[PDB]
Design a protein around this ligand. Structure first.
Ligand SMILES: Nc1ncnc2c1ncn2[C@@H]1O[C@H](COP(=O)(O)OP(=O)(O)OP(=O)(O)O)[C@@H](O)[C@H]1O
Ligand SMILES: Nc1ncnc2c1ncn2[C@@H]1O[C@H](COP(=O)(O)OP(=O)(O)OP(=O)(O)O)[C@@H](O)[C@H]1O
Ligand SMILES: Nc1ncnc2c1ncn2[C@@H]1O[C@H](COP(=O)(O)OP(=O)(O)OP(=O)(O)O)[C@@H](O)[C@H]1O
Ligand SMILES: Nc1ncnc2c1ncn2[C@@H]1O[C@H](COP(=O)(O)OP(=O)(O)OP(=O)(O)O)[C@@H](O)[C@H]1O
Ligand SMILES: Nc1ncnc2c1ncn2[C@@H]1O[C@H](COP(=O)(O)OP(=O)(O)OP(=O)(O)O)[C@@H](O)[C@H]1O
Ligand SMILES: Nc1ncnc2c1ncn2[C@@H]1O[C@H](COP(=O)(O)OP(=O)(O)OP(=O)(O)O)[C@@H](O)[C@H]1O
Ligand code: MOO
Ligand code: MOO
Ligand code: MOO
Ligand SMILES: [Mn+2]
Ligand SMILES: [Mn+2]
Ligand SMILES: [Mn+2]
Lengths: 245, 268, 245, 268, 245, 268
């Protein structure tokens, strides 16, 4: 049978780096919403990287650096977003916790306080996989690997758009972009074209053991994160293909 | 293409955008340690066997580092299998087993490193660069633990909770990401056979084979972790590997000299 | 007068590595018993090493390595047992904590949560004492040094046998092995022959300042650990020769 | 004065006591790394510009370390400015921004260090000595991140939340406290001008100037962090610095050879 | 406007190294007073260095070492004082926490327990400022930088004298030393002569953003720390020149 | 005996089993750093004395490392005694004092190491191997803090809370476990006397003595931590130590050259 759930009562929330990139205008309402959620859920809040990782990719690729060099360079930006977000929640007892602490001591930290913040990137470092010159295991992927390894009650991905569309809704084909209320990871993996989530997220969903659904919701709309953590359908649901025991 | 066009895509598109992925693929290719060779010393196949296997290899490492820059990674072996068995029986997930296996590879690195310390060769961390550049320049070799640092973020296999990326994968990925010239796996068989030589009477030795040919023969999971074969097909820098028998005296030395002992597995 | 008690309310429990070696059949009932004890006691749970340390001793001795090399190699196996045991208690808020954390921050960690797990081996590393080729300061010894330094309310040693016998009850002289309900460390130190506890444990008992009795109980019998933590006599009591103030 | 009299004051008086301060000032002066040069490679001015700027400087570093012991610190640049902007807009204090800026300088150190690794030059921690003595003796150079380690204890500026002590200050303080012979800032302009050359048509080049003269001309915050100018006036060991254009091929090499390229800023 | 307060509910207490130097006679009553304050306040307790730093200054200066070498040598002594003080409060759940932990994880640690102890020295290390051969950014300075960066409710400096005098009240001009119940940092900075607080404390007070007053009180008089944490005037008040929003 | 018989006992018996203990005693004996000498520089006896004592020893270390591989450990001294006094008066246990003493030995290592840094000699961690193999191969010396890492797990003495295993023991144990060829304690007296020379008029110098003879003369706790004498009797590799006066110019140099200055204390 499947492995046990280590932290079955845990809710994992991944905050997009590009949400953080919007600054106070986006972060202050999200922090207020997170504050209200602290008494309702036990939260592991994981931040992605955003635009600064694109800059370091631009420099690193111009220098010729391999994908195992670019991966920790990008992960650093997710960590900086996590320190920023944690600083905003410090007065609620929330702090940033490092990867080794998340890996081995999360249980005690969530006993001390209602939420902690960490980096959503996984620590693949120079052991990132070759193939693409862009690190494949990024913030969505790391957050899901963690949530599923813990057997958490859910993973909610907080985006700067309503969810997944059939095309980039801020891109050249924006006009034909249709919103997808629900999809399966296997269907997404068959599609070509951009997504708001890592392609590697769909791969780790295929080998997942616990998380059956991940919702992508618009963190720029107050209340959607709160609704999503109660299972209300306010963004795109991704079925992982895990089925119940 | 151009740097401006790549930077534009990098700012404006998702990293998943195929157009962005294609422009990044045209970037220049820097090899960080192009003159170095990565060697994996097997845990079960070598270090677990003790003095009779390890001491001749220590002698070869010492002789080889005069003419060759070496990154020497260690396998895990029977103590990791014991830990995997305990943890798997408790229902623990692959990410938990990954950390347990890494401590066994660490133990093996420390034992090998202490035998090499009087020759100046240190044990260094495996996650990245650490003391590698300085040591490689001075004493021409370092020892590291071969387990990848994925810990709780280890990708599980399709079935079961055994971490699929273990010390073959760890050593291979470092060779690949440092752009090393050569990757040698040191095990306890002369190379790849058409069947497991320990449990087959009539296995035939294979001097050279591609990954695709291996898969067409059912040998996907044989002398190397099958995930390593797929990593090899995606590699930018290390497009073949050599598997040699570390129990044969001088086999590592001869492999470093360019002799075709063992099996050469090619990406294509 | 004697040094103060740093953590007088602490109960220290040492889990034998060979108990862990039995896998789920032994670990699951022990984890269930530990879960029930979390609301009753403030627990520092320390794991020993077991059979894997014997393997690394076999390899290390074959390579000629000195006792200061073998000590951290064995300690690593106690740490792995601790990570396994903590993972099983994670959903109760229990995590593994590293040696420096145990040494300097145990008070805050036991304020955050009811129990933590650590390695029972002491960090003697390459400063292990010479004499024997087998590291003398092992899991029982480290657990006692810690319990007595803290001035803890007790130390209970959880074994795969009922207690101490006059001979190895799984050994060649098993037939003449008589169970010892109670003994003194000084008497044990005078005896030759194997024990289920480190010989160095008897030495550190002689210089102990607080712990007057240590009970060795069979962790393979559910309820003995619970009884022992209430001071009920269900295994072998070792009198350390500390006397009350 | 005497050691006994200094020790008496040290035991009996507050450290604020002017008599104690004056006796401590008479102590002997040991230079820890007197033969080394500290170089700062600008973040915005050099590393952010990519290959065209960095690769020639890598070549100069490699050539220079044959005759010169080098401590090579990195700046932060545009990613730090982005982080400062986000955090400042949230109302975060200078001590929080300081830690964010340090991770960008760390990124730049890692990129530069990976280009130098095959030449044996490591990346080392910047807070102090670390692997510096051994590396300087063997491979004659190290790379470090230039941000000072003040973190939440960063002194704020008089106005705003931008950390006033950034990578110019970090590199300068290490040159000063190690007693290095020379401090070279590698930027993207030939040196100091009477006005910002990027936004002024008629700026005039200044080959040599004192800190006091700079302040009398409104140039307190120009090509160097103004706090660095005050640190320089208080320095015991590094009483002048040189600012050179790293985009000019050979400029670093020539500066290390004693050529007066760029601007020499003197404490007095 | 001014930066937000990260931990507005925090009280910071700096214990002079020379108070610790008096041993049990001073430390035991202070520990008893701290114990009684744990249920009243959320405390960050930061220890200074005291006489041992003067010894290492004497050796280091005799060896010719620069001020960036002496700064971490002195900071080590404040850390040792912090470990001593924390050990005395361990049974109350109080532990010493390292500088990186104070900088990034204080919120979670004060959620786990009522108080933590750390070093009052800031981690300037070899990046200490040149000019004086004595490290300028010492224990008072580090404690204030932290308290003001956090936006804490106060910083109270616990001394071995009643407060600031017009001369050293244990010095050669003791006879003309007049007690100063209240002063401003700017006035103190204009005075020449010794103070019981770092001169650099007055400099960081000038750029402070939150803390308006710091009281220096005699920790050798039981009850003054308790009174000072309630804002009662029992020592020297230093006005920083921050004014309310 | 045989490896199989040892492995059988190792699997089947308690480690306390005398038969297992006896088989392990027959194992081969590898010396990790057989050509190195461990030197302890006293805290109270040397470093606390400042320039007049330390600077000549720095000169000797620099001259000696041309012909000798050196591991240089530091003592703690008067600041540790102050900390022990404060903590003991509070009722704190030996395990707490042990950590306090280690920070003073660390301070002394940093001061000594900064005087040696321009000669390439680093300060390294004392718990084990760290940067020792690489540094010993290149610059022939390292500095480390001499306190053992036992921290809260320090064995207490029979009486009192002073840690019995301090920097003499720490340095000795590293010499023993690395299998070094020589162990030299550098103190402030010519060697062992029949009484404490600082408080006895008529003490007689002892050039050579065994541990047993020392105990029969009441000298168990004299110029060396008495626990070190018992460690020496149990040692496998270092069966004698030499105690020399570091205040005599050239005494360390001459001791390294094989001259019998000072006192030789033998295990038997
Ligand atoms: N099919 C799609 N559906 C929705 N958005 C898409 C799609 N394809 C591309 N996008 C783009 O992806 C953007 C989100 O960008 P991205 O996923 O890189 O940011 P992020 O998740 O905040 O960053 P990080 O991965 O660092 O956390 C959306 O604003 C949208 O423009
Ligand atoms: N077709 C094959 N050809 C050769 N060897 C095979 C084949 N199939 C299976 N094997 C077995 O695979 C083994 C190599 O894997 P093994 O795990 O022993 O190496 P290792 O590197 O020591 O692993 P670790 O280092 O993790 O302990 C060989 O000992 C061999 O018996
Ligand atoms: N006199 C004795 N009384 C009881 N058991 C003994 C005695 N002598 C030997 N033993 C053996 O010791 C075994 C326990 O082994 P051991 O003490 O090595 O394991 P452990 O305590 O689980 O391991 P660790 O020390 O790594 O925690 C018992 O099962 C028994 O066979
Ligand atoms: N009077 C002046 N003379 C020369 N340059 C000036 C002057 N005033 C302003 N500058 C500007 O200051 C810049 C140098 O500062 P800048 O922050 O770019 O350097 P940096 O070291 O790369 O910073 P970082 O390393 O933190 O990114 C020059 O590019 C120049 O445009
Ligand atoms: N103007 C002054 N008013 C009051 N005390 C003064 C003054 N000038 C000097 N002092 C001296 O300062 C002493 C306090 O010393 P100091 O400030 O060095 O100790 P501390 O604060 O305990 O140490 P640390 O800074 O390491 O925490 C007082 O006992 C007093 O003798
Ligand atoms: N019989 C004896 N012969 C020689 N010296 C003795 C004797 N008995 C006591 N001593 C004293 O022991 C001292 C050596 O111990 P001490 O602690 O000073 O050395 P240390 O290595 O500097 O200690 P640390 O390094 O921990 O400060 C000598 O200074 C000497 O005065
Ligand atoms: O990172 Mo922590 O381990 O808050 O107790
Ligand atoms: O190891 Mo921790 O220090 O749980 O806060
Ligand atoms: O130092 Mo800690 O981070 O008590 O959980
Ligand atoms: Mn996204
Ligand atoms: Mn046992
Ligand atoms: Mn003071």
């Amino acid at each position: 049978k499947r492995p046990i759930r280590l932290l079955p009562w845990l809710q994992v929330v991944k905050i997009g780096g590009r949400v953080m990139d919007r600054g106070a205008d986006a972060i202050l309402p999200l922090v207020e919403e997170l504050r209200k959620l602290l008494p309702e859920h036990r939260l592991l809040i994981l931040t992605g990287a955003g635009v600064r990782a694109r800059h370091v990719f631009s420099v690193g690729l111009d220098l010729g650096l391999p994908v195992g060099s670019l991966a920790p360079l990008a992960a650093s930006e997710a960590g900086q977003n996590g320190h920023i977000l944690a600083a905003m929640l410090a007065s609620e007892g929330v702090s940033y916790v490092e990867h080794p602490t998340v890996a081995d001591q999360l249980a005690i930290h969530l006993s001390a306080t209602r939420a902690v913040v960490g980096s959503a990137f996984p620590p693949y470092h120079h052991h990132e996989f070759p193939g693409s010159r862009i690190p494949p295991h990024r913030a969505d992927t790391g957050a899901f690997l963690l949530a599923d390894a813990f057997g958490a009650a859910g993973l909610t991905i907080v985006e700067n758009v309503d969810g997944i569309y059939t095309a980039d809704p801020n891109g050249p084909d924006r006009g034909q972009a249709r919103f997808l209320p629900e999809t399966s990871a296997t269907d997404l993996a068959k599609s070509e074209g951009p997504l708001p989530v890592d392609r590697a997220l769909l791969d780790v969903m295929a080998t997942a053991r616990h998380i059956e659904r991940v919702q992508v919701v618009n963190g720029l709309v107050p209340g959607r994160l709160t609704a999503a953590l109660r299972g209300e359908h306010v963004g795109t649901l991704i079925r992982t293909g895990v089925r119940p025991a | 293409n151009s740097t401006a066009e790549l930077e534009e895509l990098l700012m404006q598109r998702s990293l998943t955008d195929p157009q962005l992925q294609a422009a990044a693929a045209a970037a220049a290719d820097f090899r960080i340690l192009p003159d170095a060779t990565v060697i994996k010393i097997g845990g079960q196949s070598v270090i677990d066997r003790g003095r009779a296997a390890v001491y001749p290899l220590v002698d070869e490492i010492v002789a080889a580092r005069k003419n060759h820059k070496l990154l020497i990674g260690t396998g895990a072996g029977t103590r990791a299998r014991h830990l995997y068995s305990i943890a798997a029986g408790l229902g623990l997930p692959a990410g938990v087993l990954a950390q347990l296996g890494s401590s066994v590879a660490d133990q093996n690195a420390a034992m090998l490193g202490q035998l090499l310390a009087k020759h100046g060769i240190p044990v260094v961390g495996g996650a990245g660069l650490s003391a590698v550049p300085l040591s490689l320049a001075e004493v021409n070799a370092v020892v590291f633990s071969g387990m990848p640092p994925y810990k709780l973020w280890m990708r599980p296999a399709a079935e079961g909770v055994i971490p699929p990326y273990r010390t073959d994968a760890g050593c291979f990925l470092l060779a690949e990401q440092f752009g090393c010239k050569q990757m040698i796996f040191v095990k306890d068989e002369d190379g790849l056979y058409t069947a497991n030589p320990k449990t087959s009477k009539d296995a035939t030795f294979i001097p050279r084979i591609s990954v695709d040919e291996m898969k067409a023969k059912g040998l996907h999971d044989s002398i190397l972790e099958f995930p390593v074969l797929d990593l090899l097909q995606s590699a930018q820098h290390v497009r073949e590997v050599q598997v040699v028998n570390g129990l044969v005296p001088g086999n590592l030395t001869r492999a470093l000299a360019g002799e075709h002992v063992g099996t050469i597995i090619t990406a294509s």
